[model samples]
Target: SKPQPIAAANWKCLLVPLIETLNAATFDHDVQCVVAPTFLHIPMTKARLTNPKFQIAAQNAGNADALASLKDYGISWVVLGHSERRLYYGETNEIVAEKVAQACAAGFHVIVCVGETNEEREAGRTAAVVLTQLAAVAQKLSKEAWSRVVIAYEPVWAIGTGKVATPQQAQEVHELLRRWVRSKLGTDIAAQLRILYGGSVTAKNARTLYQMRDINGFLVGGASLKPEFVEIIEATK
Candidate 1:
């Protein structure tokens, strides 16, 4: 059977008092909540989070030495290719693919982020752009490597812009990606793949998106830092 819903909390660096808040907040234990804070903040965040459902994730996949301490901290998840990294840091598909291969080779599960920008969408190249990004990573990963991957669709047009993909819009892309997974890695791996929707995923709209057929979960941004994340986690139930 498919795994339970996932709610990967991508806190893009500081200004976080909510970590203190969420340590005591409610969460659906069955759903995995991967907390990804900035590089320096991981220890504090991980030390503070006491929930069994929560796990620490690195915001960016670092080099071999940078990733070495994860074992000491019990960190299992790592997020790569987030839109911010692509837009601000100039992370190309090839770079993201390498980071993914590096992390997966280290025996850690990865949240591989992929999406298109506003201009790409306007140009009606959404599918092409999205698929190309994913294809690059697929080429680097083996069939067995597919099990350690989780794909998060982060519409660049959305994401901290306060814009979000409408439920129907996200479902179409999610379905398209799932089908692509089947073609690339066979149906068995595709069926087990968890494709999450990102870009301003809030508790206000969490349940609506969660109900989408192919939307197994979310890559929550701002909402995950607040009390609303607790409600969003409840939505999974």
Candidate 2:
């Protein structure tokens, strides 16, 4: 069966009010809702959050050693290779791969991100770029650990750029990733793997995008900060 659809909130603006708002929501158990606040806000969110179905995820994992302390904050999920991390922090495929393995070892479910920049996409290198990034993870990740991994595809051109992938475009890349995973990691893992779509996801477009056969869920950005996020979480139904 497909995994419960995930709608994860990435603290796009780091607003405390937003955290309280999210904390106040009575989320449905039909979807897997994750709130990824910044490290500084983890404690507040951990303390304020009370929904049994809503989980706390971390925006980033500091290091393999620091990962051991993440659970103490009640964090169950960690996002790695986010576009900002790659652009601002110089996170390479190898670095992200290392983090994914470390986070899983630390018993944290990980969101492994991969995306193609505008130039790369225009240059027709989307597959090469995305596959190369994923391949790096495959090199270090164990098959058993695959259970903890969720892949989020965020096209750099579409993110923070006012551009959104049409449902067709989203499905094309998602299917491509699924095919790649099947070929490289084998059918069993690919069949169970959950691939998420991010970049401009809003309640307005969530249903259409997620209806794609390969787009299992969403790694929400700005939309996650709004009350509409509740709608996005229920979209899978």
Candidate 3:
């Protein structure tokens, strides 16, 4: 979630309530909860949201120099190549590869997002586009480095649009992605890798998505800010 200007006394409003809600849930022993706030809010977030269930992530990283500072704050993860970063900031696949390598070199777990825009999907180029995006980074990432990375599939059309890919659609893409990974990196690496479905994930639909074998979890957006996120968390649990 991005930062919204609230009065100074209410700064905690952005994260505290959500943290409390998550902490109150009956978490599965294996459930891993992570939150990535804007950079400025990291210190405050690190201070307040303390639970083994919660880990903080940086929204994006420019380079190892950028990632190094966040590492000091005990940030364990970084998100790279998110659709918004690629669209608004003009991050290319090479740029994403550079950042992912840097993040991995510094021992940070990376959530490497890859997806096709609506036009690309309409052209039936979703697999091609996604594979091309991953290819650049795959070259830079070593077999060991791959273990620290999670893939987030955030199809552009569905994000923030209230339009979600149906369960079958999501599973098809996820299954294809897993097979592609297996071909590139082998069964061990592919089997252990976590691929999350991120576009328009809400509590109402999370259970169905979770039921699919290859969809390991989510990289949620707006719904994560509401009480409904507790339900979404419950769905995954």
Candidate 4:
């Protein structure tokens, strides 16, 4: 059997034209691809992403009626609480929780983002912060909803500063996250959850990142804006 391929498209509005072009070129490729464009771009992007395998995602959503609008575009997945939204846009844990609650209410699949900054990681708080964030969501979500949620851990230090975590570090943390998931969400749900690593996730380091046991997939950046995004998608299997 062929290994399944998946990609997440998170180009902001300005990049939508390029994303649509990538979609056109990759239309026949055997991959499960998603585009997480800005809301302004989603309507136009979805109109072009008619292929069954090419779906759309919201870059981020507020916990508002905005979710009802998303259902109109047939969106199934969304990227919530990205590091940039935190570091730059000031997204909060409570806010991310609300957005996730809305996603769950709207029956949208969510890729919940969690990670520690360089300061926190250097202070040895990575594991603790990650655990706290996921625990927050676990409390908000139903057991059945576990099937619809994916967790993404994107360490702020590694993203685009050209510093990537070693495969060993990723593997260790992934294992820890898996264990923590078990402790918080129950063993059955933990086993089935897809926990992805984000943060400077690119074609260069993708293969190494995929070797970890609990790293089911990726929530990519930079690379996700290009057709080379396929490399990280191929890494999972």
lDDT of each: 0.84, 0.84, 0.76, 0.73
Point out the higher-scoring one by TM-score: 1 or 3. 1
lDDT of 1: 0.84
Residue 84 lDDT in candidate 3: 79
RMSD of 2: 1.7
lDDT of 3 by residue, 1-237 (tens): 111100001111157786676556666546566777777887777777756666788877766677787788788787778787788888999999888989999999888889988878889999999888888889999999988888888878775465668988888888888898899999888888888877777778988888887888787877877767766666665
Is 1 or 3 the stronger prediction by lDDT? Answer: 1
Error of 2 at 144 (Å): 0.7
Q: Which stretches of candidate 4 lie over 4 Å from their true place?
A: 1-6, 13-31, 160-162
Please give the lDDT score at residue 99 for candidate 2.
Answer: 86
TM-score of 4: 0.87
Give candidates' CA RMSD values in order: 2.0, 1.7, 6.2, 3.0
Stronger candidate by TM-score (1 vs 4): 1
Better of 3 and 4 by TM-score: 3
Off by over 4 Å in 1: 14-17, 26-29, 160-164
Q: Write the per-residue lDDT of candidate 2 for residues 1-237, one digit (tens) a residue.
A: 666678888874546666676667675457777888877777878877777778889877777668877787567799889988887889999989988988988999999999998888989999999999999998988898998899999988786475768999989988999999899889999988989997778899999988889988899988887778877877877
lDDT (10s digit) by residue, model 4, range 1-237: 222335565676356556565655534445556778777777777666655666788877765577777777687788887877867887777778778877987898888888888788889998898787777777788888888887777777675465768877777777788898888778888887777777567788887777667776676767877767756666654
Shift in Å, residue 52, candidate 2: 1.1
